[PDB]
Design a binder for this molecule. Structure first.
Ligand code: SF4
Lengths: 205, 724, 184
């Protein structure tokens, strides 16, 4: 009866999808959103008592998306499509910085709100497609420290090319760092992450 | 109008109080809530009346009761001078005269460091106006009292000195350009604004010290800390006499016999010539400082008469009248000192039946004594003083004794056998010494940090237009905590109602309280006791028995002793032990002089205990004569005045604890008898605002918990107060 | 703004007296365990050390360092202290002077005195240390416990630190929390 949360971060860089619009394998935007859909759907497929939340960090904002198994996931799907369309209709480090700030405060809110035995684990994942710049060193650092001081594991995945601050996030917090070349292979390895690295990081891998 | 910051407020109160005492030309009784700097407000508003003139003649003589407080008054009005001297811009001159006579006198090294005051001033005046008035010019004989002659020079001249001076300002000026305190005191009395000196100087009819010219149009005088008015007047006009003193007087009479015999013409022909000049015209033979060195007026509103020298023709027969007086007087003394008596007119009238002449040489013995040595001008004042005492006594007994009493008490006053015989001649009219001070002046102001029952003003008897208990709120949440300690648990006898020291379980509960008191309370504690002899008993049962060492486990005792030296030693140790790491409690006696002047401020000694009840011990017969003459006033008084003076001693002792608002004040009455006695004598504002919500029968340990709460909540905060 | 704090705890028989958790050293010790943990939670760039005032002495108990487990193990061992003898501020300030004369003075040097507000029993006049440490610029802030001692006030006013006395153990936490943040 581990009241387990999972929180996810998705990039929303139109420059990065313009990079990923001239490619040969050509996974789409909706392909990665379906990937994250499947991540969340898999973790809620794990048990009822697991909850979950996803953001897509907008250039100008950050709006979160969170949800009879099939219908729960379908409501999630519809919410996800709707705000993903909102992001595609309303559009670098600011995006994801302010999003992870929103994230921690939403973990605070979800922790403060619904606790019964006050039992919990607030695990979070992060997917960043492109680079994360050091124009806000203090903010990113501060957020990683607040994440450690809230006892929260931060896992991470990079798609295109490595950034410093994400690697340092991984190092300080205690969650793994990931980067796979082939992209649907990376999607199914995120599935391997959400299963093993979320539940039973113990004897796994 | 001098606020210098925003006030308690007190100037909001005393501004209106003083405007009421100055519109209506009247006496007035003020009351100080002890955290007030009464000194600041009084001196300020008085100076405000100095620099204005709705009345053109404007004075202030201001007193106090201790030689340090004189200096304290000085410095604080130096501060007052400074502030709106700067603010008002252009400076108009000033003078405040600290007129200290006795021990603050002489710059000659031969004279100065002999310890006492009176005798050494006799050496001074014997040198100045007895050796250098008789041998008026000599090398060796007239000694170098050179700056008296400098006074001669600048008393012919007119300087203008600067402002109000310290005591040591005038000694440093002694060195430089302001030389004698006495004679520059004279020249500066010729014109001064504010003159501050001791309360005992102004009301003393042993030697009535005329301060100023009694110019009765307008004159303003303020009595500071004015609690013990009755006892000052009484002890200033009572006269005590010992048979040892009488035998020194008999030796002195034989010495004067020798001096009369060895002088055959010259000073006696001087006396004959000058006495012919006095018969031809009534003249003051010594206009200079000799009458100040004389017993000036043992009877002040009574005349310097016309029928002077009534029963004497020459010296040695009047000397024989004094010989008859002493021999018949020691005869009187032995035959009365058989058994103690109380009589005002019986002794004087029976002596009028025994001694030949009645009521005129009795009325002139003082002046004729002093003048018949002034024509001799050889006898040293130290060798002569008990005869001065005697003639002063006979003058008093002559002209006064109808409200006075005679009481003659040759026995134990806590002592061994009849080897110390002695009498006392006191007033009981407090009026007969303060009535001068009322009738002379425009207005005096009796100031008190303590005078709560204003129904015992009529011991002074007089008339009094401004009489209100001063109310001043304390937004520094609670400046006090009275906490009266009667055991519920160990079944209190903390009052000494068995006897003074007939039991000691009393004292063992006291020591329980003291040890837990020193456990909690920091910074030394000021432990008022009952009597010297009860403190002797207490300390004996403490340092003998189980108690004392655990107190000595914590802190250090400064036990007073009956000198001024031990006062000095324990006081120096108290301040130097409380400004360091250690507590070191003082334990004293309430009527011992340590109360007056010391001012235990918040830096040290911030939790004042009364132990017992400060009543004067209730069986003595002087007090019975006192209460019978006041049963001739109000008839209920037989216990009422006892409770009155117990309370004025109590609050005078306890209410030193606080200097400001921002200040820490515990006051704890280890007593039983304080229910209605402290709903009388503690200040009515203090009983209403701070006292005994439910605290009357506090067990010590409850007292300790109240103390912990109080100390902890006075040590927790501070920023915000009555910004007024 | 790097700090070099020697916490000076007291071991008089004021640690037999209650108004706190069963002995005052228990509350004070437990909230010093919190203080170490939060002082490395906030200040890794600084260094601490326990000095226990005991039997008119002071005893250095843990060196000036940045290794928390030694400090907390020292606390664990100082749990069961009998607390013999009235204290002494003089020895604590002497130890602080000795070990802290040698550190570089481009940095703030406070010293936390957790004194039980018992009688300041010293063999030598601490007023002279209050003279010296002014010029030395070693700062000193003092938390008494259940009383205001005058000498600690003069200490905390010439040195330039902060003094406080405490009723609620919640309030004790309030003041340790205040001293966490680095004073200028
Ligand atoms: S007059 Fe002035 S100097 Fe001469 S004796 Fe008195 S004090 Fe000493």
């Amino acid at each position: 009866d581990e009241l387990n949360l999972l929180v996810i971060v998705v990039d929303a860089n139109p420059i990065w999808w313009g990079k990923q619009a001239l490619k040969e394998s050509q996974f789409t935007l909706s392909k990665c959103i379906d990937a994250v859909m499947v991540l969340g759907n898999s973790h809620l497929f794990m048990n009822r008592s697991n909850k979950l939340a996803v953001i897509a960090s907008h250039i100008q904002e950050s709006r979160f998306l969170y949800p009879g198994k099939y219908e729960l996931l379908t409501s999630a799907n519809e919410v996800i499509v709707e705000e993903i369309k909102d992001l595609m209709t309303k559009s670098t480090e600011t995006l994801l910085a302010g999003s992870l700030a929103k994230a921690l405060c939403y973990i605070h809110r979800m922790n403060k709100e619904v606790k019964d035995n006050q039992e919990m684990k607030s695990r979070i994942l992060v997917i960043k497609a492109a680079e994360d710049s050091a124009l806000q060193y203090m903010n990113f650092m501060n957020v990683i420290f607040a994440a450690q001081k809230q006892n929260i594991l931060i896992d991470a995945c990079v798609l295109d090319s490595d950034s410093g601050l994400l690697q340092q996030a991984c190092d300080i917090t205690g969650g793994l760092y990931l980067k796979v070349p082939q992209m649907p292979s990376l999607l199914q390895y995120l599935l391997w992450v959400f299963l093993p690295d979320q539940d039973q990081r113990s004897q796994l891998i | 109008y001098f606020p210098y910051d925003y006030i308690y407020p007190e100037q909001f109160s005393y501004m209106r109080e003083l405007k009421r005492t100055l519109d209506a030309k009247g006496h007035g009784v003020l009351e100080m809530p002890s955290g007030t700097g009464k000194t600041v407000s009084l001196l300020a508003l008085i100076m405000a009346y100095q620099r204005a003139y709705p009345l053109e003649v404007t004075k202030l003589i201001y007193c106090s009761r201790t030689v340090p407080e004189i200096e304290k008054v000085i410095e604080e009005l130096r501060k007052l001078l400074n502030f709106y001297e700067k603010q008002e811009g252009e400076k108009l001159p000033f003078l405040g005269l600290a007129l200290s006579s006795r021990k603050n006198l002489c710059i000659h090294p031969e004279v100065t460091p002999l310890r006492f005051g009176k005798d050494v001033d006799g050496k001074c005046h014997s040198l100045t106006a007895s050796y250098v008035r008789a041998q008026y010019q000599h090398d060796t004989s007239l000694p170098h009292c050179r700056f008296y002659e400098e006074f001669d020079a600048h008393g012919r001249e007119v300087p203008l000195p600067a402002g109000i001076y310290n005591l040591d300002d005038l000694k440093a000026l002694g060195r430089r350009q302001g030389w004698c305190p006495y004679f520059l005191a004279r020249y500066s009395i010729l014109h001064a604004n504010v003159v501050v000196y001791s309360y005992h100087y102004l009301l003393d009819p042993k030697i009535a010290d005329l301060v100023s010219k009694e110019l009765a149009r307008k004159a303003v005088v303020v009595f500071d800390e004015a609690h013990n008015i009755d006892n000052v007047c009484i002890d200033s006009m009572s006269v005590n006499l010992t048979r040892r003193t009488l035998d020194r007087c008999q030796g002195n009479l034989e010495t004067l016999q020798k001096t009369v015999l060895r002088i055959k013409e010259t000073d006696e022909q001087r006396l004959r010539d000058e006495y012919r000049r006095l018969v031809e015209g009534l003249r003051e033979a010594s206009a200079a400082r000799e009458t100040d060195a004389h017993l000036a007026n043992p009877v002040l509103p009574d005349e310097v008469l016309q029928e002077a020298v009534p029963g004497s023709i020459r010296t040695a027969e009047h000397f024989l009248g004094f010989l008859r007086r002493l021999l018949e007087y020691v005869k009187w003394r032995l035959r009365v000192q058989h058994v103690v008596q109380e009589s005002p007119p019986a002794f004087l009238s029976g002596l009028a039946q025994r001694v030949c002449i009645q009521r005129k040489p009795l009325r002139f013995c003082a002046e004729r004594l002093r003048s018949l040595l002034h024509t001799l001008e050889i006898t040293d004042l130290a060798d002569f003083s008990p005869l001065t005492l005697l003639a002063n006594f006979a003058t008093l007994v002559s002209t006064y004794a109808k409200g006075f009493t005679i009481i003659i008490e040759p026995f134990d006053d806590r002592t061994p056998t009849i080897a110390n015989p002695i009498l006392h001649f006191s007033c009981m009219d407090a009026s007969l010494a303060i009535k001068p001070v009322f009738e002379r002046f425009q207005s005096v102001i009796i100031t008190s940090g303590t005078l709560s029952p204003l129904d015992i003003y009529p011991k002074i008897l007089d008339f009094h237009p401004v009489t209100m208990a001063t109310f001043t709120m304390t937004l520094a949440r609670v400046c006090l905590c009275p906490m009266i300690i009667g055991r519920g648990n160990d079944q209190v006898a903390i009052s000494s109602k068995f006897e003074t020291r007939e039991d000691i379980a009393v004292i063992r509960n006291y020591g329980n309280l003291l040890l837990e008191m020193s456990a909690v309370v920091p910074d030394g504690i000021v432990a008022f006791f009952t009597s010297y002899q009860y403190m002797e008993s207490t300390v004996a049962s403490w340092y003998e028995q189980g108690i004392l060492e655990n107190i000595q486990r914590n802190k250090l005792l400064f036990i007073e002793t009956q000198d001024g030296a031990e006062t000095s030693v324990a006081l120096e140790k108290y301040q130097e032990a409380c400004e360091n790491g250690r507590g070191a409690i003082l334990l004293s006696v309430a009527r011992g002089k340590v109360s007056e002047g010391i001012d235990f401020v918040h830096h040290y000694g911030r939790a004042v205990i009364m132990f017992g009840v400060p009543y004067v011990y209730t069986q003595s017969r002087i007090l019975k004569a006192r209460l019978e003459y006041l049963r001739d006033q109000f008839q209920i008084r037989e216990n009422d005045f006892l409770t009155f003076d117990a309370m004025r001693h109590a609050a005078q002792c306890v209410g030193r604890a606080i200097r400001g608002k921002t200040d820490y004040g515990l006051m704890v009455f280890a007593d039983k008898r304080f229910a209605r006695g402290d709903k009388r004598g503690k200040l009515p504002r203090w009983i209403q605002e701070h006292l005994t919500d439910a605290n009357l029968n506090l067990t010590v340990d409850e007292g300790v918990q109240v103390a912990k709460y109080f100390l902890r909540q006075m040590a927790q905060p501070f920023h915000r107060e009555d910004q007024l | 703004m790097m700090r070099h704090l020697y916490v000076v705890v007291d071991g008089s028989r004021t640690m037999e007296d209650q108004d706190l958790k069963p002995n005052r050293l228990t509350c004070t010790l437990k909230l010093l365990e919190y203080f170490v943990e939060e002082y490395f939670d906030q200040n890794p760039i600084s260094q601490i050390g326990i000095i226990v005032t005991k039997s008119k002495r002071a005893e250095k108990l843990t060196e000036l360092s940045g290794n928390p487990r030694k400090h907390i193990t020292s606390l664990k061992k100082a749990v069961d202290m009998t607390c013999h003898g009235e204290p002494s501020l003089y020895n604590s300030l002497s130890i602080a002077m000795q070990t802290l004369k040698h550190m570089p003075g481009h940095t703030s040097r406070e010293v936390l005195i957790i004194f039980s507000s018992l009688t300041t029993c010293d063999p030598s006049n601490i007023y002279d240390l209050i003279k010296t440490l002014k010029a030395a610029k070693i700062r000193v802030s003092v938390i008494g416990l259940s009383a205001e001692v005058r000498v600690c006030t003069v200490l905390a006013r010439e040195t330039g630190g902060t003094y406080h006395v405490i009723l609620d153990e919640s309030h004790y936490k309030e003041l340790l929390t205040h001293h966490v943040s680095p004073p200028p």
